[PDB]
Amino acid sequence: SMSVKKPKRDDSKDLALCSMILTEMETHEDAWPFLLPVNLKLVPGYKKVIKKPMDFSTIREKLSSGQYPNLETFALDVRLVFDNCETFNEDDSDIGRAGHNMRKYFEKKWTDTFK
Ligand SMILES: COC(=O)c1ccc(CN2CCN(C)CC2)cc1
Numbered sequence: 001s002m003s004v005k006k007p008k009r010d011d012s013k014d015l016a017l018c019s020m021i022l023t024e025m026e027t028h029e030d031a032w033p034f035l036l037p038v039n040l041k042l043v044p045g046y047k048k049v050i051k052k053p054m055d056f057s058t059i060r061e062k063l064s065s066g067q068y069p070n071l072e073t074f075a076l077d078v079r080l081v082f083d084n085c086e087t088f089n090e091d092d093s094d095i096g097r098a099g100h101n102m103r104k105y106f107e108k109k110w111t112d113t114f115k
Pocket residue numbers: 033034038043084085088089095
């Protein structure tokens with residue numbers, strides 16, 4: 001509350017660390033469905049069904065341009081990518097499996113790096 005603060009967590013390295021995690025995600029061999037925006041003109045249903053499309057290149061642009069106010073808003077966009085993937089793809093599909101794999105990969109890096 002007013003004039004009463006928890007000890008200040010060091011956040012000076014968060015931008016650089018999030019960038020490293022994103023780089024490792026971009027270079028994963030199962031990243032290919034998530035590297036670029038899903039083409040809304042070529043994939044039937046996607047625009048209507050998926051209210052907030054998200055992908056690694058959009059996350060990279062937002063990160064490089066100071067559009068994430070903190071750690072958590074970054075993690076929310078990353079998770080949004082895999083939540084969208086689950087909504088639109090069967091678990092037993094290549095893209096479905098890519099999504100589950102990448103989410104697991106992300107959450108480990110997240111925990112090891114910040115928790
Ligand atoms: C993250 O990307 C997606 O969620 C996504 C991407 C592409 C398609 C188009 N499908 C064309 C037919 N193909 C057998 C499966 C992909 C659908 C969903």
